[PDB]
Amino acid sequence: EAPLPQLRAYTVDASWLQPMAPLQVADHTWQIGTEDLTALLVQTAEGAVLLDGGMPQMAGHLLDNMKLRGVAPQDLRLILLSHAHADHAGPVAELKRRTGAHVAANAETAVLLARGGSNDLHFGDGITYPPASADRIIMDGEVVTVGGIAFTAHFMPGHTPGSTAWTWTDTRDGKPVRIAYADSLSAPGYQLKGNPRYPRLIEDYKRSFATVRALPCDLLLTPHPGASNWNYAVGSKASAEALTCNAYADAAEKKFDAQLARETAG
Amino acid sequence: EAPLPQLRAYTVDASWLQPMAPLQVADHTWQIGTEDLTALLVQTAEGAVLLDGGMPQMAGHLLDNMKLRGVAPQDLRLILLSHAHADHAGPVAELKRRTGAHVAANAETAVLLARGGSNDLHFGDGITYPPASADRIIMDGEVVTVGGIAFTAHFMPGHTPGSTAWTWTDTRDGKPVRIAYADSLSAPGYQLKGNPRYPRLIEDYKRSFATVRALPCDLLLTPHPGASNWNYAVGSKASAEALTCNAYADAAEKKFDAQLARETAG
Amino acid sequence: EAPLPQLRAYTVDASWLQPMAPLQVADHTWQIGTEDLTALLVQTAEGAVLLDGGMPQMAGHLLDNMKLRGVAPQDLRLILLSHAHADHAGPVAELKRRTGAHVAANAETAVLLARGGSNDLHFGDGITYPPASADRIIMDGEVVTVGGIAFTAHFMPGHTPGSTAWTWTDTRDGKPVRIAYADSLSAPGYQLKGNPRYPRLIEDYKRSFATVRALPCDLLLTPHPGASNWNYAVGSKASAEALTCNAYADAAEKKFDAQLARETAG
Amino acid sequence: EAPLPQLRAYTVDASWLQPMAPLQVADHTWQIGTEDLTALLVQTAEGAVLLDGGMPQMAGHLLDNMKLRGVAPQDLRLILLSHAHADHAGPVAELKRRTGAHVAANAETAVLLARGGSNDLHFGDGITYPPASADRIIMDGEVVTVGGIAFTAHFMPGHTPGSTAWTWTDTRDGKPVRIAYADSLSAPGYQLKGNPRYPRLIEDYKRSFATVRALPCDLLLTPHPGASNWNYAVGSKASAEALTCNAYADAAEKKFDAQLARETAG
Ligand SMILES: C=C1CO[C@H]([C@@](NC(=O)[C@H](C(=O)O)c2ccc(O)cc2)(OC)C(=O)O)N=C1C(=O)O
Ligand SMILES: C=C1CO[C@H]([C@@](NC(=O)[C@H](C(=O)O)c2ccc(O)cc2)(OC)C(=O)O)N=C1C(=O)O
Ligand SMILES: C=C1CO[C@H]([C@@](NC(=O)[C@H](C(=O)O)c2ccc(O)cc2)(OC)C(=O)O)N=C1C(=O)O
Ligand SMILES: C=C1CO[C@H]([C@@](NC(=O)[C@H](C(=O)O)c2ccc(O)cc2)(OC)C(=O)O)N=C1C(=O)O
Known part of the structure; x- marks a missing residue:
């Protein structure tokens, strides 16, 4: 008799997990994630903001790059998110524990983050990560x-x-x-x-x-x-x-329309 | 340059995932989990109680065995837990969604369950599972x-x-x-x-x-x-x-004392 | 020196707290709240649904009226909400404790319910009530x-x-x-x-x-x-x-437009 | 017919709400609450700690006294609690919003704080206050x-x-x-x-x-x-x-023993 299947890890392409040194985007904005996952550090006179963190295992790398930029862990004030999937919000819980930063997010992102990405509308429980709470709900x-x-x-x-x-x-x-x-x-x-x-x-x-x-x-x-x-x-x-x-939206809409027609076609 | 490591799944011995048919323990109490993980169904005139559920992937098997016992999903009233690790509380979130059952647990178990076993005192984030809320806190x-x-x-x-x-x-x-x-x-x-x-x-x-x-x-x-x-x-x-x-406690204490001495010895 | 002010209770017109017997709306739908707060009971062959519950102190009255309708506490399966203010979602936490019902709500309602109506966008902390969790998030x-x-x-x-x-x-x-x-x-x-x-x-x-x-x-x-x-x-x-x-929307929009102009006018 | 009773506010003696200026307890520790509710500010080289905050309406006074001590809102790093009743944990949610401080508490305090003191073991819903989350669970x-x-x-x-x-x-x-x-x-x-x-x-x-x-x-x-x-x-x-x-414990135990005997005596 077959046993039930083992749990399957959320695995990603190696380039998504390839560390990089900070890359300056503008005077106060730096890419500090990996070669293929964005994590933006915005440095202000009163602390830093992080926009996304990548995968759960990127927490230490992000703190390393923050230190290279002159940002101690406690200098991180705020975490913002694009969306609360494991490859963008993965390390948020650990970052909150290690930095004291607050998370600001809308209600939909907050509820998904609080269940660690489980019970996803499309992916079920396949991309669960450590849950985190939002400290400020935004509109x-x-x-x-x-x-x-x-x-x-x-x-x-x-x-x-x-x-x-x-x-x-x-x-x-x-x-x-x-x-x-x-x-x-x-x-x-x-x-x-x-x-x-x-x-x-x-x-x-x-x-x-x-x-x-x-x-x-x-x-x-x-x-x-x-x-x-x-x-x-x-x-x-x-x-x-x-x-x-405009080009990003156009490319995405063309892809969406084509996918919609293929779904109609099976 | 080495990329960061991939996430690692919580894998267990195959016997922990080996389904079994319901095994009667007493007049109203049945083992309905796997060969090596306990999940007790207690059937009453006003609904059923589940004590532990095993691993996350056991949710469907548990509902199958409940049906064999005459217990429809909505007949499950209450889930109780030994402790909130992934191999005992794994399927609780899914069971709540599919049955409407309430969870009763003490505050320590409730907070661990609500973070899906992440940030474990000893195991870090290695045994995370889908978070669930406790509906009743017990003393x-x-x-x-x-x-x-x-x-x-x-x-x-x-x-x-x-x-x-x-x-x-x-x-x-x-x-x-x-x-x-x-x-x-x-x-x-x-x-x-x-x-x-x-x-x-x-x-x-x-x-x-x-x-x-x-x-x-x-x-x-x-x-x-x-x-x-x-x-x-x-x-x-x-x-x-x-x-x-008495024998269970004695065996566990002997093992604990020996482990304590080995920890003192390195 | 003036001490800080005492906390102020959320008080409402007496008619909002005036119990009434169940009033049939259609074959399975009953008004079971008060003279001036709606609480709809929909009775099905597989349990009952409650839409809103009114003020926090209405919990016992709602259960009384459910019993008059043949609905025991454990027969309540589902609570739905219009919005999570104290005079509509007030008794939800108590009802969940006493009935085992699940709450289904959208993410915005879920986050407001989970903070008991505190930190309201317009009313601050003046209309706080006992917090409750949503068991199902709906779109x-x-x-x-x-x-x-x-x-x-x-x-x-x-x-x-x-x-x-x-x-x-x-x-x-x-x-x-x-x-x-x-x-x-x-x-x-x-x-x-x-x-x-x-x-x-x-x-x-x-x-x-x-x-x-x-x-x-x-x-x-x-x-x-x-x-x-x-x-x-x-x-x-x-x-x-x-x-x-149409008439309800028209009346509300006329009132809104007039209020908007008065806000422009001070 | 009597309507249901109005909600009753949690009212306290005026001295519990009587502001006072900071009172030095030791080199870095200050009483900054009211005449009859303790709120201790401990000032360190790397930020401040608050132990209790008093009633919900004391949030602004606490921040005023922090400013008198040289502590800006964002300088508050940590909130600790004696217990999570409304007259000691009352302003925690607002303080977290306005300062970014983290809360550390044990699991029992965390679950009571997260339901805003509702469903109290002894006081029911009579002393509810705005809920707050604990960011660190302590043992x-x-x-x-x-x-x-x-x-x-x-x-x-x-x-x-x-x-x-x-x-x-x-x-x-x-x-x-x-x-x-x-x-x-x-x-x-x-x-x-x-x-x-x-x-x-x-x-x-x-x-x-x-x-x-x-x-x-x-x-x-x-x-x-x-x-x-x-x-x-x-x-x-x-x-x-x-x-x-020793004297505090002795006085409390004598009072407890006497109350226990009076409970036995009705
Ligand atoms: C285009 C993609 C695809 O890759 C990721 C994604 N998906 C995956 O990484 C991948 C997949 O879609 O094949 C996946 C692997 C394993 C799973 O269990 C689920 C999804 O992250 C969850 C997704 O959001 O779809 N994200 C994007 C994106 O645009 O953010
Ligand atoms: C004796 C054990 C060991 O196996 C499980 C356990 N551990 C493991 O399954 C196993 C291990 O301890 O080697 C483990 C695998 C992977 C991990 O990331 C962590 C732990 O479950 C988390 C544990 O609680 O220690 N549980 C028990 C138990 O008594 O409940
Ligand atoms: C038209 C009203 C006004 O009365 C209630 C309301 N307001 C009040 O009951 C009342 C008020 O608006 O004057 C109020 C009393 C005390 C407060 O602290 C806040 C509001 O409930 C919170 C509100 O949503 O505005 N609700 C509605 C409604 O349409 O639901
Ligand atoms: C000795 C007391 C009594 O006063 C407060 C208390 N009680 C009250 O303030 C008061 C009361 O006990 O009479 C009370 C007023 C209103 C209520 O709804 C409940 C309690 O705070 C909730 C309590 O913990 O018992 N706290 C203490 C204390 O030791 O902390």
Whole structure:
């Protein structure tokens, strides 16, 4: 008699777990994650903000890179998230324990984070990670400010119900740089039509494409750098091929429409 | 450059995942888990009680065995736990979703369950499982009653801070049978002395040995059947070699004392 | 020197706390709350559903009326909510403890319920009540079914971010009766414009008026019966003057637009 | 027909709500609460610790007094609690929101805090306050360190299951001062014998008297200053009549034994 199957680990491509040194994006904004997972550190006069953390096992690397930037663990004030899947919110619980940082997130992201990604609308229990609590619930368009730097939330539901873009204005060469950290717009293996767990999925994606098109943006970044044509491994050329918000939304919508037709076709 | 390691699944011996048909323990009490993980179903006139559920992937098997016993999913009223590690509380979240059952547990077990076993005092994040909430917090000696059957909690901290023995009186051949479901008394790989996360660990274990010795008991069962010398695979002979509470406590204390001396010896 | 002020209780009009006997709305749907707070009991072959519970002190009255309807406490399967303010979700924690019912709610309602209505977007801590957990998170358009009766969620944010209308089809005289339990559309004392805690408040209300207009509805009910021109105290004439969904939405939008202009005017 | 009663506010003696300026207890420890509720600020080189906060409406006063001491809101690192009743943990949720501080507490205190004091073992829902989450769960004897100052937890269950004494060593006149902040040992209106919600209440109190007697202590403080014969209103004479730990435990045990006999006598 076959025994029940063993639990299966959430395994990812090696490049998602490949550490990199901090890569400067603008005067106060640094990529400090891995070659293929974004984790943005924004350094202010009154502490630092982290946008996403990658996989659960990246906690120590993130703290190492923070130290290279002059940021002690207790200097991390705030953690913001694109969406609460294991490869973007993975280390949040550990980071909170080791830094004292607060998490700000919308209600959808908060409830998914608090159950550690279990009972996912599409992935079941296959991508569970250590649960964490949100300390501040934010609404669409709400502004969170640290050290004078204002981060604005733009809800873009679809990839998860709580998917969020974050925008802020940094500087470079004395000129403002409007940064938009837009969430994933993929639907990998999702049932798009008539999904009982997400009945308005298609309507939400369509609205989210429009939301991304309209973001204030001189420089777009995404949780997976490849989704916006970044290449973190090539240093000062990393942003050279980066997409605009319009191009990112267009590419995602074309992919979505094609997937929708293939779902209709089996 | 080495990438960070992949996440590692919590894997167990195949016998822990080997389904078995329901095995009657007393007039209303059945073992419905696997060959090497206990999951007790107590069937009352007003619904059923489940004591432990085993590993996360056992949820469907438990519901199958409940159906064989005449217990529909919605007939499950209450889930009780020995301790909230992944191989005993694994399927609790799914069972709650599929049955509507409530969970009753002490505060220590409730907080560990709510973080899905993450940030374990000894095991870190290596044995995380889907988090679940406790619907009723119980105190030491508190009585929980379903369908007239009274279950009494006996706290026995050590293996986890929330480790609990549950006792109830069933029947067999018209005579009462005092059942004691006592938790694990092992300390596998634990730092026993001067543990900053559990400073009174040794004192708690020593008290818990005494608590187990004094339990009202005609028939002892344990989360791992082998710990009390049960053999679920041999049917009506399964209980033949079962230990008394005194023998179980004595064996565990001898093992603990020897481990303590080996820790002193490196 | 003045001491700090005493805590102030959330007090309501006496009619909101005036018990009434069950009032039949359709073949399986009964008003079982007070003269001026709605609490709907829907009785199915496989248990009962409660939609809202009123104030915290109404828990015992609700159970009394359930018993008059033939519904024992353990027969209550599911609690649904319009929104998680103290005068509609007040007794949910106690009801869960005494009945074993599960709560299904969207993420916004779940987070507000879990903090007992504290840190309200508009009311601060003035309307706190005992916190409760949601056992099932639902999405817009999701169907929850008990005993074959399907309840559909329609999100209508504004009064709270989690405000929800629930629809189901009952019967009367052998004909179907599409019931719509639509949430409040009031904004009592709210700052509508440029509210930092709810930046898209006006956009959400405007969308919610349209959502209410389009609900499937032969019979509209509301958390406050007066909002839809019900009068629970007059028995079989209670529904005589009830508004349509279109009239309810129109009246609320006219009131909102007038309030918006008065806010512009001070 | 009588309507259901209105909700009743938790009202306290005016002196419990009477603000006072900071009163120095030792080189780094200050009383910053009210005349009759203790709230201790311990100031370190790496941030401040708050032990208790008093009533919910004291949040602003506490922040005012912190500012007088040179402690900005974001300088508050850690909140510790004696027990999670409304008059000691009242403002914790607001303080967390306004300061970013973490809360460390044992599991019993954490679960009571997370339900805002509702469903109290003895007081029902009469003393509910805004819920808050614990960020770190601590065990008996565990050491929490901020800025080099070590705070040790001593569990003393009875008044609440999670009641805790905290000890640390400060200085004065170049000599060490062992401070013990011991919790309440009262049982106001409690059913002591055969309490189904707290079956081992008497055993826990008796053990807690012994725990308090054995605390390392040169200077005892208590959540209610009068319980240890402090008088915060008389400035530099405030500690003159303060009890020893032995005298505090003796007085509480005599009161408990007398109450136990009166309960036996009706
Ligand atoms: C395009 C992808 C696909 O890879 C990840 C994803 N998926 C996976 O990593 C991968 C997969 O989709 O094949 C997966 C592996 C194992 C699982 O159990 C579930 C999903 O993360 C959960 C996902 O969100 O779909 N994320 C994105 C993304 O856009 O964020
Ligand atoms: C005696 C044991 C050992 O096996 C399990 C245990 N441990 C393991 O299954 C096993 C181990 O201890 O070697 C383990 C595997 C992987 C891990 O990441 C952690 C622990 O479950 C978590 C444990 O509690 O120690 N449980 C018991 C028990 O008495 O309950
Ligand atoms: C129209 C109202 C006004 O009365 C209640 C309400 N408000 C009050 O009961 C009342 C008020 O608005 O004056 C109130 C009393 C005390 C408070 O601390 C806050 C509000 O409940 C919280 C509210 O949601 O605004 N609810 C509605 C409603 O539409 O649901
Ligand atoms: C000795 C007392 C009595 O006063 C408070 C207490 N009680 C009250 O303030 C008071 C009372 O006991 O009479 C009370 C008022 C209103 C209530 O709903 C409940 C209790 O706080 C909840 C309590 O813990 O018993 N606390 C202590 C104490 O030792 O901490």
